[PDB]
Design an enzyme around this catalytic site. Sequence first.
Site, short mmCIF file in Angstrom:
data_model
loop_
_atom_site.label_atom_id
_atom_site.label_comp_id
_atom_site.label_asym_id
_atom_site.label_seq_id
_atom_site.Cartn_x
_atom_site.Cartn_y
_atom_site.Cartn_z
N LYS A 27 71.64 85.85 100.80
CA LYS A 27 72.94 86.02 99.98
C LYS A 27 72.59 86.02 98.46
O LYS A 27 72.95 86.67 97.71
CB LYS A 27 73.80 85.10 100.23
CG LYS A 27 74.92 85.03 98.98
CD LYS A 27 76.05 84.09 99.34
CE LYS A 27 76.62 84.10 100.44
NZ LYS A 27 78.06 83.63 100.58
N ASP B 69 83.41 73.30 95.09
CA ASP B 69 82.40 73.94 96.29
C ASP B 69 81.15 73.59 96.27
O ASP B 69 80.17 74.28 95.66
CB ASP B 69 82.50 75.44 96.55
CG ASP B 69 81.74 75.95 97.57
OD1 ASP B 69 82.38 76.04 98.61
OD2 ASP B 69 80.56 76.56 97.56
N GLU C 19 85.94 83.70 98.53
CA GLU C 19 85.57 82.28 99.13
C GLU C 19 86.63 81.21 98.87
O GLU C 19 87.05 80.56 99.79
CB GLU C 19 84.24 81.90 98.82
CG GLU C 19 82.90 82.81 99.73
CD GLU C 19 81.57 82.26 99.22
OE1 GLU C 19 81.51 81.22 98.34
OE2 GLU C 19 80.59 82.60 99.90
N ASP D 42 82.65 83.59 107.74
CA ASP D 42 82.13 82.85 106.37
C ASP D 42 80.72 83.24 106.48
O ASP D 42 80.00 82.50 107.26
CB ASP D 42 82.74 81.45 106.43
CG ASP D 42 81.82 80.71 105.46
OD1 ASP D 42 81.51 81.40 104.28
OD2 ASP D 42 81.89 79.61 105.80
#
Lengths: 376, 158, 151
Positions: free
Chosen positions: A68, A191, A169, A6
Amino acid sequence: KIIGIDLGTTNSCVAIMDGTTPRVLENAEGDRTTPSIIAYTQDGETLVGQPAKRQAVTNPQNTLFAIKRLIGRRFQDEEVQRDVSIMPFKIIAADNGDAWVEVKGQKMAPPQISAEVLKKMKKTAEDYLGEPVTEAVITVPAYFNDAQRQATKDAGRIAGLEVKRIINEPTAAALAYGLDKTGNRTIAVYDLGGGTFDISIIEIDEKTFEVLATNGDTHLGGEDFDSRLINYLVEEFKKDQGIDLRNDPLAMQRLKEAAEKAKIELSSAQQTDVNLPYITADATGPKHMNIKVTRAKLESLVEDLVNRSIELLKVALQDAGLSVSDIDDVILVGGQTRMPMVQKKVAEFFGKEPRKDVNPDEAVAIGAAVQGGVLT
Amino acid sequence: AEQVDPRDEKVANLEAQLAEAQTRERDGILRVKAEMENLRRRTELDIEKAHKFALEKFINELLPVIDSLDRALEVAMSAMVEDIELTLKSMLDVVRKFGVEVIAETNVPLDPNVHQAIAMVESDDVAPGNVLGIMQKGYTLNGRTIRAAMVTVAKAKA
Amino acid sequence: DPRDEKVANLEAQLAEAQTRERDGILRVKAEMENLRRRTELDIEKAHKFALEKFINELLPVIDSLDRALEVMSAMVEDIELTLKSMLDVVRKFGVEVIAETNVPLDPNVHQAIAMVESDDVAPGNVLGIMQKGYTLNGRTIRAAMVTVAKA
């Protein structure tokens, strides 16, 4: 073995199936979670994770993080350009015209950076199983344009990892809980991360997976829930003592962590104490900080941020034309969801209690391990 | 070697299966042998690990108790102090018994493995880059860091 | 017959190696599970053991906080907070304290070191704690030295 990975924005985790049972591995330092930071020390050392986070202050321009946010984008973009304004590090334009980063004058592609972290995970799994590893699944945000998913693929190559499949994800968390085998379930993954909040409503038509509706924030996660407590404290001091700790680097960096330790303690307790002796000093002698923060005050401090999440939780279903009823399951992902108030405020907008039988920060990593699991 | 008689190609078949059988068995028995060899490597590690860090959770929950103690010496009847100075000494000296060492040594370069630069300070008291002073003790248990020290690194004269 | 008798023994030769593989797997697969189950034991013992030795040498350190809190008004409010958390932390691992006075003497928990005339408690009842006692999960680990009240 296809170690699942992850590759978080703020933290990354890595897992491998011990038989049929998910087993989240732990790095050299004994953490099951490794920050996604990477710094090139003045003297030429390439630190990654905890150690890299620890020398950030003393080395802002070469301690890269939140890479990211740039992985698969061009030097122009709402994101990229608007980051160029806050990132302490140099984000330049690539010849290809992609968004890159310059460290100490040398220019590297975003992927070249993440690979450093994947490198560390691969070594972490290898350190466990004994044998070298070379295969993995890496997770991406349900909204990742082919560009990012690929650039996220280049990172693995650079790390000696043959990406055997880069899954979502949200899907990751779903596979992580057990939404694979009656015959049709409708999931919604809440999330809330270290810096980002992304909501996903996916359909597992039974065993297919389908992003039904996706929405989330770019500026909304713990790090933002933190600044609420930090500030409360800076203001409180000023009221009770007429001082601006803001002005002070040493005091601020100090108060920041205390707030952070406070924020976490206030989720298993009703009140805690920000105790910082010799917090500062002025013409009237030395100053000490001792405040009391209650679950309640904190909550009051982080309200509009928890509700901002939900208002987005509203347009996510308006676009997916369903009621909290249509939603058969809702899972949480993001250490920050450990806060009672979000657990609740969410349990209320969906009616049923969200499920968390599985670690909020290991979930998506575990999902990724099971997919590449006996499957791939 | 003629083998058109079905009954001959039948014996020739069984002969082949069995050869396969022998093959599977040999190898299928080698991977489950090697397979445990790997579980023995782990059990040893898992053990040597839980030996080093058995108390880590405990000795980690006391850090905030060592902290309020010296915190109480900071804000600081001469005896009560030498008293609470002696306590903090038995505490530290005791956890040190169980493999814990205290990170609290200045004028050493910043080591992010057990240091947390919490601020840059313009000083010549030590070489640029070295810990200039410590804001808070850092503890290590048998090699792994349980809490990096919060240091103050030094920057050049002006 | 030359091939019938051979065709039979071939078949057998096959059942042997077949089941021999099957069983052989099992033996090593249950053999591996004992290795597992047995190392957990061995890790959970050496731990219960280290946890007890530690908790032990730590007792004198708590005593220190006592001796000190027992010899300024805001300093002490501190040593009392340090103490409460010392104990709070320890509870977490099964360590409780023996220091309830006015309880009949109990050699399992108390160790009378002196007796004294008093009316503060019927006679025989512990009175005054020269030192606090401790127990992890009940098993008395250190008896509270006490002073039993003699009429």
